[PDB]
Amino acid sequence: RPRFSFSIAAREGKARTGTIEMKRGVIRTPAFMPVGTAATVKALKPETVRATGADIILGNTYHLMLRPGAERIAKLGGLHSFMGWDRPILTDSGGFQVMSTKQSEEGVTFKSHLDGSRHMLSPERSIEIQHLLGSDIVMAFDEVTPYPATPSRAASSMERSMRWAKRSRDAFDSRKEQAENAALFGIQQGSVFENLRQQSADALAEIGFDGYAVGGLAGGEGQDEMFRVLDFSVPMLPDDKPHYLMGVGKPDDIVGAVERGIDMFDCVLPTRSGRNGQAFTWDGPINIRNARFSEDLKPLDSECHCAVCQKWSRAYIHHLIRAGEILGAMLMTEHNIAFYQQLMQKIRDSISEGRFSQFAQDFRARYFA
Amino acid sequence: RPRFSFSIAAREGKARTGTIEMKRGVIRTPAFMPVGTAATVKALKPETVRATGADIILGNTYHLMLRPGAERIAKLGGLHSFMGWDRPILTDSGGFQVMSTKQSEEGVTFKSHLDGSRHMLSPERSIEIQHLLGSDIVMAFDEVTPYPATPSRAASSMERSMRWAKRSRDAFDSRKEQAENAALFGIQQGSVFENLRQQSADALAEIGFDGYAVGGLAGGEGQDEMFRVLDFSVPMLPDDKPHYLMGVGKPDDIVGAVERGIDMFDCVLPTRSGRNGQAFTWDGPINIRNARFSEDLKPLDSECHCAVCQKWSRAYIHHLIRAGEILGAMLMTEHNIAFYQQLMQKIRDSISEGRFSQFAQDFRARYFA
Numbered sequence: 022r023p024r025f026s027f028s029i030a031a032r033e034g035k036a037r038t039g040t041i042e043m044k045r046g047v048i049r050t051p052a053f054m055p056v057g058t059a060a061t062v063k064a065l066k067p068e069t070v071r072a073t074g075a076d077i078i079l080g081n082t083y084h085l086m087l088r089p090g091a092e093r094i095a096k097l098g099g100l101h102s103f104m105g106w107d108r109p110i111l112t113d114s115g116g117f118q119v120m121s122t123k124q125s126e127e128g129v130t131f132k133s134h135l136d137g138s139r140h141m142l143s144p145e146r147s148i149e150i151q152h153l154l155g156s157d158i159v160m161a162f163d164e165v166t167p168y169p170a171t172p173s174r175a176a177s178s179m180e181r182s183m184r185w186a187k188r189s190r191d192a193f194d195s196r197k198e199q200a201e202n203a204a205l206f207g208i209q210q211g212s213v214f215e216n217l218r219q220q221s222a223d224a225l226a227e228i229g230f231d232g233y234a235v236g237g238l239a240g241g242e243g244q245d246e247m248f249r250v251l252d253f254s255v256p257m258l259p260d261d262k263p264h265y266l267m268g269v270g271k272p273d274d275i276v277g278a279v280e281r282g283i284d285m286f287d288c289v290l291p292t293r294s295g296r297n298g299q300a301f302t303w304d305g306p307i308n309i310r311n312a313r314f315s316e317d318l319k320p321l322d323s324e325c326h327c328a329v330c331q332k333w334s335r336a337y338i339h340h341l342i343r344a345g346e347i348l349g350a351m352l353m354t355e356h357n358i359a360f361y362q363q364l365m366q367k368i369r370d371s372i373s374e375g376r377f378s379q380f381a382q383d384f385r386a387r388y389f390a
Numbered sequence: 391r392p393r394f395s396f397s398i399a400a401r402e403g404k405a406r407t408g409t410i411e412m413k414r415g416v417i418r419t420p421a422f423m424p425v426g427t428a429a430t431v432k433a434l435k436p437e438t439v440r441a442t443g444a445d446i447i448l449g450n451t452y453h454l455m456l457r458p459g460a461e462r463i464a465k466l467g468g469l470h471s472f473m474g475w476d477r478p479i480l481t482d483s484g485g486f487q488v489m490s491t492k493q494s495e496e497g498v499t500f501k502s503h504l505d506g507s508r509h510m511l512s513p514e515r516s517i518e519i520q521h522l523l524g525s526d527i528v529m530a531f532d533e534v535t536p537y538p539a540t541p542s543r544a545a546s547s548m549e550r551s552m553r554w555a556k557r558s559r560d561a562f563d564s565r566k567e568q569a570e571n572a573a574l575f576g577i578q579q580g581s582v583f584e585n586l587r588q589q590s591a592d593a594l595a596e597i598g599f600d601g602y603a604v605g606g607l608a609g610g611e612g613q614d615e616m617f618r619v620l621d622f623s624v625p626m627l628p629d630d631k632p633h634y635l636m637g638v639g640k641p642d643d644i645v646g647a648v649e650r651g652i653d654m655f656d657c658v659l660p661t662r663s664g665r666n667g668q669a670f671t672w673d674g675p676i677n678i679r680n681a682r683f684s685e686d687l688k689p690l691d692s693e694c695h696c697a698v699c700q701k702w703s704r705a706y707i708h709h710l711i712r713a714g715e716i717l718g719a720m721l722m723t724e725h726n727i728a729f730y731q732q733l734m735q736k737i738r739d740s741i742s743e744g745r746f747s748q749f750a751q752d753f754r755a756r757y758f759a
């Protein structure tokens with residue numbers, strides 16, 4: 022396999038389906054990436070993550086640098102070896118967690134929430150950490166402006182992000198092993214403003230990246246506004262490269278974003294809300310803690326092919342979650358990630374067959390019935 | 391398979407190895423039974439429990455009656471179906487948790503620690519709950535005297551326990567489906583007193599049970615005293631039936647107890663201490679939280695055949711446990727239960743080959759080096 026190759030096999034309107042080939046494996050798109058916060062997809066062995074259908078997982082640079090440490094992971098053989106996942110890993114840059122402390126044009130300094138120790142992030146240090154981890158898809162370090170943002174502040178943050186995108190590009194390229202084996206994605210900023218999104222897209226395309234993320238969304242704006250911004254923002258990006266919507270999201274957000282040209286997604290929703298008792302179903306989410314499930318012998322979802330729905334009832338999972346049992350988190354998480362992967366597979370198949378618009382309509386009618 | 395058949399294949403001194411055949415499966419002895427508190431062996435799917443080598447698991451009557459409820463489990467198809475374990479299950483009677491609230495010759499009434507609701511246990515109700523759960527090995531309901539106990543109080547509790555053993559026998563026998571498909575074990579009491587242990591053994595043998603537990607030990611007395619009581623107590627029990635030491639224990643306790651004629655064990659140690667960071671190894675226990683393991687690439691144990699030791703390092707598990715990650719509990723628990731099963735297999739093989747005394751000596755020399 023090549024370092025990086027994105028091929029589009031089929032299209033329907035703005036939606037695309039295809040593959041990204043990388044040294045560690047093939048990624049089917051549109052793709053959902055389970056989030057591995059601190060070198061684990063919470064409550065799942067990597068083999069279980071793979072069995073759900075995941076082709077790639079996300080690791081968080083900010084968290085890994087705090088614990089167990091980037092240099093430590095490198096000494097131990099890199100993130101893949103450390104956690105036992107041998108397929109591609111995308112790492113975020115830290116820009117989001119920095120927003121979520123001294124800031125300057127050079128970068129940011131901040132105190133660890135775990136120990137109070139002082140840490141620094143910059144385009145150069147973020148790229149270095151992602152190298153030490155050994156990630157396959159490296160994200161440029163950006164400045165993420167909060168929502169809502171004034172036009173002036175959105176412009177200033179976008180302009181800084183573009184300067185930092187060039188610094189990220191140069192840092193990545195200067196490291197031979199990284200440049201030859203990994204890929205680098207740029208991140209579009211500009212808040213909700215069309216002119217700023219255009220300037221950002223133009224700057225990123227001039228620099229040149231392997232993929233382009235739409236940054237700064239899902240920050241409080243709501244679905245209608247997010248979709249409106251995607252309507253104009255995604256077509257600004259190079260058509261022949263993957264389009265990644267960071268930190269999205271709910272199943273309906275994913276379907277609508279694919280309709281608008283997005284190829285890649287990550288979010289903590291299926292894992293985090295799984296541990297809290299929320300299970301995704303084709304008829305919409307349910308909260309398994311609800312007393313109505315205490316004697317319900319049906320599986321979490323009636324059609325789901327996952328191992329949890331093959332083997333255990335709602336009633337059992339209800340009991341586990343109510344009791345605070347670890348197995349409850351395990352089963353809920355496996356089902357939710359499997360559900361997300363089945364959603365992505367239905368999306369890919371429907372685009373390939375030219376019936377994605379119908380799928381989206383049918384999905385929504387049932388999910389929100 | 392028959393309802394119950396215990397066969398002894400080989401002996402060495404007081405130690406025995408063999409099999410218990412039951413309708414749901416064969417149990418190799420000496421056996422270790424992982425503890426499923428509230429219908430789950432904590433942090434493990436039943437298939438993982440089985441893969442470690444477990445032939446039977448324990449369920450706690452006291453906890454299950456409080457949550458999710460015995461009648462509820464029965465309505466849902468019984469404990470095996472509910473939790474997805476199709477092999478034998480032994481249920482304890484509740485006598486221990488009652489000690490751990492109004493007491494009388496009829497039984498005990500108590501308040502739920504979860505809800506404050508009032509509950510009752512008696513020989514008849516305990517046997518009924520174990521029936522509703524559908525367990526394969528049912529334990530008689532006893533009164534467990536605290537350690538230390540005066541001779542008078544030990545005698546009174548033992549005598550009550552024997553009256554309750556007869557009531558348990560009669561309750562079990564009066565329920566056709568239970569009598570025909572499950573087995574019933576009696577529990578010897580008498581604290582540390584030889585004459586009381588003899589009276590108890592004689593009473594239980596007169597009533598007649600499928601198996602005999604040594605109750606009331608591991609209550610604070612320490613290993614030397616426990617071994618001393620086992621020295622005289624186990625030979626009092628019928629030789630041709632299984633001997634079960636309840637709530638034991640550490641690997642060295644197990645080896646010494648097998649040397650004294652015990653066939654079955656259960657304890658929360660490998661699961662509970664696994665979640666806390668303690669990992670069992672042939673060179674003794676380690677606490678994986680210790681900073682010395684932060685960059686240790688070796689598996690938890692150098693010889694262990696378990697999947698955790700095949701795939702992940704001490705350094706990784708150290709990180710997971712320090713971070714409070716669920717996967718840490720999962721991996722520690724799987725390894726510890728697998729370690730216990732490998733210990734039982736080495737015990738069985740060494741007895742079968744007439745080299746158990748040597749095995750015990752070699753095990754101790756290395757474990758305590």
Ligand SMILES: NCc1c[nH]c2nc(N)[nH]c(=O)c12
Nearest residue numbers: 116117165236237238267268
């Ligand atoms: N939802 C926006 C988002 C999530 N994660 C991110 N990481 C980075 N570096 N930038 C971003 O804009 C975002």
Ligand SMILES: NCc1c[nH]c2nc(N)[nH]c(=O)c12
Nearest residue numbers: 485486534605606607636637
């Ligand atoms: N270690 C003693 C023990 C553990 N569990 C028990 N359960 C019962 N019914 N009786 C007992 O004596 C014990």
Ligand SMILES: [Zn+2]
Nearest residue numbers: 325327330356
């Ligand atoms: Zn499912």
Ligand SMILES: [Zn+2]
Nearest residue numbers: 694696699725
């Ligand atoms: Zn192991």
